Specification:
The complex is a heterooctamer, with two copies of chain A (97 residues), two copies of chain C, two copies of chain E and two copies of chain G. Chain A is mainly alpha-helical. The longest helix of chain A is centred in the middle third of the chain and has 26 residues. Chain G is mainly α and 94 residues long. The longest helix of chain G is centred in the middle third of the chain and has 28 residues. Classes of the chains: A mainly alpha (97), C mainly alpha (81), E mainly alpha (104), G mainly alpha (94). Chain A binds a DNA duplex (151 and 151 nucleotides) through helix 1 and helix 2. Chain F: Its main location: nucleus.
Amino acid sequence: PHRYRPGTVALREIRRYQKSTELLIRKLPFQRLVREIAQDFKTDLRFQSSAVMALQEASEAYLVGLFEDTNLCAIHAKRVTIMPKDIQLARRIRGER
Amino acid sequence: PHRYRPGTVALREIRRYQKSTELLIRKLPFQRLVREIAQDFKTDLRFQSSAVMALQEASEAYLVGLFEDTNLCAIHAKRVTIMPKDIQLARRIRGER
Amino acid sequence: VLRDNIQGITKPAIRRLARRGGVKRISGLIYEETRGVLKVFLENVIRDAVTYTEHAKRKTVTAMDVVYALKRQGRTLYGFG
Amino acid sequence: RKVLRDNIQGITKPAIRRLARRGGVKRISGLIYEETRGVLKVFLENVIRDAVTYTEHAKRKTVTAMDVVYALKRQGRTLYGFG
Amino acid sequence: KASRSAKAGLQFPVGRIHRLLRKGNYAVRIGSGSAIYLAATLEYLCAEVLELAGNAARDNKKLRIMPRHIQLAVRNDDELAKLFEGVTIADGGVLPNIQSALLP
Amino acid sequence: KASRSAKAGLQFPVGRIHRLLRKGNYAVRIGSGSAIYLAATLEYLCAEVLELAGNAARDNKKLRIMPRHIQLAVRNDDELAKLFEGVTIADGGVLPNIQSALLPKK
Amino acid sequence: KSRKESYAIYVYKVLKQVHPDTGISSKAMSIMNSFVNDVFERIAGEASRLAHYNKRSTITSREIQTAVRLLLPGELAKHAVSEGTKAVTKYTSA
Amino acid sequence: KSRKESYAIYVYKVLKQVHPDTGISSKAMSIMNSFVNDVFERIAGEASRLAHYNKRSTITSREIQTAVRLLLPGELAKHAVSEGTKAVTKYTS
DNA sequence: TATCACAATCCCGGTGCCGAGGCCGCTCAATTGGTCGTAGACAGCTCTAGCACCGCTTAAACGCACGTACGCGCTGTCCCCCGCGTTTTAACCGCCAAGGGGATTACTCCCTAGTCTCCAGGCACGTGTCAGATATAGATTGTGATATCCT
DNA sequence: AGGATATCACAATCCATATCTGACACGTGCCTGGAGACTAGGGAGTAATCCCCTTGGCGGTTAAAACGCGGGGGACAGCGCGTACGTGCGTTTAAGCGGTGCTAGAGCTGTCTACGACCAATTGAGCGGCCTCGGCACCGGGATTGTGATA
């Protein structure tokens, strides 16, 4: 039947997610990930229901900020696809490791 | 007579300047530049002979640090030449403007 | 105990994160890589958070602990405490 | 009083080439020189303005080494060797 | 009696700000012009950000400033986005910005 | 009269560091152990950097530590380069390093 | 019973004076309160360091004015210094 | 003639005990002195903020221990803690 | 694909010079000893408040088929960037005279801490109304496939 | 016989409206902390010197920069092609919600106790300043990998 050409559902998704301001990761998998990470620093911890929310907001802001720079670095090389080379280059220019 | 192929005097220069630790800009043009810039913030100023030295050290460290990232961004795009696109990309990823 | 939760950051979640960032087309090897990045960021923050907590002799990681852990990496977060 | 003009062209091409070589660059395009002069001017304004603020706060006229070191520290560019 | 924050035409509490400066271990002695000056700049920054936020909320057919509008009005201004260098705003979204190469 | 540095087994000054704490406006009152602890960490970090710098200077048949050697010994250490992250060192040069894609292929 | 102080009512006064017909949600007020706390601590810390480099012991209006000039960029700092001067003058006129 | 109050001779002592046959220039002494100053200011600032968050008023050794555990990265913060604890313990004796 | 002549690079070493190390006198600040107010460690208690589980949905994820466009690889062009040689122009070094500003010291007058008191401004708590969110529906729109008009 | 191209059809976004709940604006009670008023005081403004150190000038050397030519190599354009990513459909599965019980931790209050600030006096440690030398730069010169031209 109908079939959108590759690169219009993508732009509609871009325009939809850049507009709304929800949380993009499912709260429960992220909370379990946070607890599994914290297991290595103090056994039998306890997390407020808002500390996890702050960690998730910070994490999503960080990943979005990283993908913006990865996209710039990908466009720099005559492309539109982003590959791990771009992420690693962005994280090297920004000074992380 | 003799003629080094393009790209060996360059590497010899790279190996020579990465090894020695002098100052690479002539002190007097840089000092005049600093004074001409400061003219716009307080008329009839006065510079210690060591403040100019600190400004020059900081400036050269900044420019060297910028050229390292510009070189990475140029190699990223299948090149060895660095163009203003690379400098602007590096200064955008690093967060400056 | 919990094992292998970094797979909870599913591939569609990463697609949505990239779409908010402005990416039109994502390679196939990004996803795994991205998880790595995430699993490092948290390790650098949560640790500080825990350090800010067991110093106050407490046992519950507050939201101010996370806010301070962020602030001490130049990543200030407005909105929590 | 002197008025100095057109001094950014004092940072000549071979000096910029030397900086690039230290940075590790092999081949330099031809339009990098004006761009580098621009970047340098911007950084220098940003640092000299803070240095002059620190100086004219303490009721002085002589931009000291420590005024520059503080103007740099408050940009995340700590500079060991002049304090 | 007469309030101090209202003695200078301000809206931010000069008393609370002065007590915070004193009991905050910034210097030993603290002048009486410091509280008023600090409160004036704090109120100016609040007025500017709130004005731009209200404008951005009206240009979206709403009546209540939500975090979305503060993020919009902060990233969409030069000096303010310079003052907000590394600030994440919870529930702020991002600026709507598609590149030019990705467009059809 | 014995110096507190000697009692605590250090070399760095405990008295001077304690006073510097008391008159720096860090808190209203400062405990006795804070000076000793801070001095111990300061001396340890100094020992680390100076040891590595002396090594890097001996690798050049030079019996004197110059800024160049401090830079070489700080950038070649993961943790110290993480501690000197945003720091410039005057007269320090840079690390000898050429990217692969610039060398002559053959 | 415990209490905590915030800049809620003050930010709300400023809003009702600059935008008389516009409310402000709860989360936005928390954001503005965090913003005020952060800018306050930045200006005050920089002023402390300033009054410590010149071996002074008093954070007068001079230190706050210079700290505002150092932190706020460009046209922001100009207007903020102007407002601070006007306020100090009005108050000193008793 | 006002006095200049630096960490020159203490850095020199540490060096002469850890690398007994090597000297140190004057530029390198200035760099190490500024380094000690910067690390001191970082650690003291963090200890102050830690005392301030927990509604305390004293900078005990606990706060300096935590500030070291925050600022110093990875494996350094273990040896620095060991040295500090050993020094305090020998002081109390 | 193996060999040759030349243009840096490196090491030996000899001199000097100069920046590091040793040493002296003072002087300022670290140490010692009481005295005291002060915050901080400690036990109980009441109450949140985060953890655990479970039932039930249902929205979101996963896996597969396909087929389209994008990354990549090869070739060719020619523009532009490096190497090299000459000339000269402006940096470097230094010697120095003016002088302008920064540091110091003593006075003093102004502005801030400390303390008790008391009132009024701010916070927790209820209360109800208004605006954001949700559900349908219609009209506007942007995208994609196609017959038709050109070469 | 295919491309251009205006043209026709269809899924998605967006106003317009009812309606609905919850989240904010508003009034109230109470408390705690800010404002006066007085006292003591010590820190910053003012003045005067003075010494030092920064600007300006010049004058000589000399090496770094500017220019101009010439050759090569690398960046860009152009095309084919293979694959790998987006799109869509159908099944399944955990995430969300809400709800209840449990106990663990946390904030608060009183209680004590040990500990750190304050002050007065003492001496020793460290700093500025003057000598003495040994590591480093600097130059000449011999030996050594390396690089483009030969074959």
